[PDB]
Scaffold this active site. Structure first.
Site, PDB file in Angstrom:
ATOM      1  N   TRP A  28     -38.547 -23.539 -15.013  1.00  0.00           N
ATOM      2  CA  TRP A  28     -39.153 -22.311 -14.516  1.00  0.00           C
ATOM      3  C   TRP A  28     -39.890 -21.579 -15.647  1.00  0.00           C
ATOM      4  O   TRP A  28     -39.333 -21.434 -16.736  1.00  0.00           O
ATOM      5  CB  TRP A  28     -38.044 -21.413 -13.979  1.00  0.00           C
ATOM      6  CG  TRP A  28     -38.468 -20.148 -13.286  1.00  0.00           C
ATOM      7  CD1 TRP A  28     -39.392 -19.983 -12.262  1.00  0.00           C
ATOM      8  CD2 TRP A  28     -37.903 -18.860 -13.525  1.00  0.00           C
ATOM      9  NE1 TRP A  28     -39.436 -18.653 -11.891  1.00  0.00           N
ATOM     10  CE2 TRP A  28     -38.530 -17.946 -12.642  1.00  0.00           C
ATOM     11  CE3 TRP A  28     -36.920 -18.382 -14.418  1.00  0.00           C
ATOM     12  CZ2 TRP A  28     -38.222 -16.586 -12.626  1.00  0.00           C
ATOM     13  CZ3 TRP A  28     -36.612 -17.016 -14.418  1.00  0.00           C
ATOM     14  CH2 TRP A  28     -37.270 -16.129 -13.504  1.00  0.00           C
ATOM     15  N   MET A  95     -34.952 -25.945 -13.170  1.00  0.00           N
ATOM     16  CA  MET A  95     -35.352 -26.040 -11.758  1.00  0.00           C
ATOM     17  C   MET A  95     -36.066 -27.371 -11.460  1.00  0.00           C
ATOM     18  O   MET A  95     -36.108 -27.805 -10.295  1.00  0.00           O
ATOM     19  CB  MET A  95     -36.221 -24.841 -11.298  1.00  0.00           C
ATOM     20  CG  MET A  95     -37.661 -24.821 -11.930  1.00  0.00           C
ATOM     21  SD  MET A  95     -38.724 -23.725 -10.945  1.00  0.00           S
ATOM     22  CE  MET A  95     -39.051 -24.793  -9.407  1.00  0.00           C
ATOM     23  N   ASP A 222     -24.544 -23.078 -21.918  1.00  0.00           N
ATOM     24  CA  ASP A 222     -25.698 -22.673 -21.108  1.00  0.00           C
ATOM     25  C   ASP A 222     -25.478 -21.343 -20.367  1.00  0.00           C
ATOM     26  O   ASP A 222     -24.651 -21.263 -19.439  1.00  0.00           O
ATOM     27  CB  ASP A 222     -25.991 -23.835 -20.103  1.00  0.00           C
ATOM     28  CG  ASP A 222     -27.339 -23.718 -19.410  1.00  0.00           C
ATOM     29  OD1 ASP A 222     -27.806 -22.573 -19.152  1.00  0.00           O
ATOM     30  OD2 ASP A 222     -27.993 -24.756 -19.083  1.00  0.00           O
TER      31      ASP A 222
END
Length: 271
Positions: A28, A95, A222
Site C-alpha cells: 500500500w 496488501m 511487525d
C-alpha cells in the site's frame, strides 16, 4: 512499459532481464520501485523480473472504479497474458500478498511455479464474526478519516511504525523521503479504497486454492500487519507452505532486511 486493462486503465510495469519470470506486487502507498533491489539482485543472477504499479499508484492511471481485489487480481492476469508469462513465481508484499493470492483463486495456477507472501495481509486482516483476533475495523475507519484530511502527513507519520524506527530499526532520511515521494504520486481515491479492500477482504477461501510451493516470510516485530493473525496463519492454511520469521523485523523489511530477503528469494527459486 504499459498495458491497458479491461476497463481502459493504463498500468505501468518494468520487465527486466531474461530467464524464468518473477512477478512482484507492491504494498500500500508504494509502487514498483519498492522492489528495485530484489529485481536487480535476481535479474543479475539469471531471472526475469517484472513489477507493475497497481492501478491508482505510482506511474499508472488513477481510475475511480475497480479499486478492489477481484479487479487487482484480473489486472495481474492481464499483465501475465500481455507478456505470455509461464512458470511465474508470484511475490506479494503487504496488501500485495492479497492480489497474487486472489489471482490464483480466480484464474488457477497453470501459469504459476511458486508463491511468496511477504508481510502479507493474508489470510485475513480485519475482524470478522469468526475472527475477533483480527484488527478492529475502527482502526481502518481511522486511517480513512486521517487520509481524507491530510494524506501527505499521514504517509510521513506512517514511516516510523512501518520501518520500526520507533523500535530501534535504522533507516535513512533518504529512504523516508523516497517512500513519501512515491506515495504522493498515488490517487487519494485509490489510497482510501485500498484501506477498504485490505481491511475487509477474506482470503481464507483463496488459501485452499493455492496448490504451488509457497514461502511465507514475516517479521514478528511487525506493527502494521500482525504476524500472529496473518503470516503465521497463512503458512498453516496453505498446504506444503514454508514459513520464515525474521526476528523483531518490522513491516518494511524489504528495506531493513534486504540482503536476507534477496538470499531467501534466490534459495526459494533454486529449490
Amino acid at each position: 512499459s504499459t498495458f491497458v486493462a479491461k476497463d481502459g486503465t493504463q498500468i505501468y510495469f518494468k520487465d527486466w532481464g531474461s530467464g524464468k519470470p518473477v512477478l512482484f506486487s507492491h504494498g500500500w502507498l508504494l509502487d514498483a520501485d519498492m522492489w528495485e533491489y530484489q529485481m536487480e539482485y535476481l535479474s543479475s543472477r539469471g531471472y526475469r523480473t517484472i513489477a507493475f504499479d497497481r492501478r491508482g499508484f505510482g506511474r499508472s492511471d488513477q481510475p475511480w472504479t475497480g479499486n478492489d481485489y477481484d479487479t487487482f487480481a484480473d489486472d495481474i492476469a492481464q499483465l501475465i497474458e500481455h507478456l505470455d508469462l509461464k512458470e511465474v513465481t508470484l511475490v506479494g508484499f503487504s496488501m500485495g500478498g492479497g492480489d497474487v493470492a486472489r489471482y490464483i483463486a480466480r484464474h488457477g495456477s497453470a501459469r504459476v511455479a511458486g508463491l511468496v507472501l511477504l508481510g502479507a495481509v493474508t489470510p485475513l486482516f480485519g475482524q470478522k464474526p469468526d475472527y475477533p483476533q483480527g484488527v478492529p475495523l475502527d482502526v481502518f475507519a481511522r486511517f480513512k478519516t486521517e487520509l481524507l484530511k491530510d494524506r501527505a502527513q499521514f504517509i510521513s507519520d506512517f514511516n516510523a511504525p512501518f520501518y520500526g524506527i520507533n523500535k530501534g530499526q535504522v533507516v535513512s532520511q533518504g529512504v523516508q523521503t523516497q517512500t513519501l515521494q512515491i506515495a504522493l504520486l498515488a490517487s487519494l481515491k485509490a489510497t482510501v479504497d485500498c484501506v477498504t479492500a485490505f481491511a475487509e477482504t477474506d482470503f481464507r477461501p483463496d488459501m485452499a486454492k493455492i496448490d504451488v510451493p509457497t514461502l511465507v516470510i514475516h517479521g514478528d516485530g511487525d506493527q502494521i500487519v500482525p504476524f500472529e493473525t496473518t503470516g503465521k496463519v497463512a503458512a498453516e492454511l496453505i498446504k506444503g507452505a514454508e514459513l520464515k520469521v525474521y526476528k523483531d523485523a518490522p513491516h518494511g523489511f524489504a528495506v531493513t532486511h534486504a540482503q536476507q530477503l534477496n538470499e531467501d528469494l534466490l534459495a526459494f527459486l533454486k529449490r
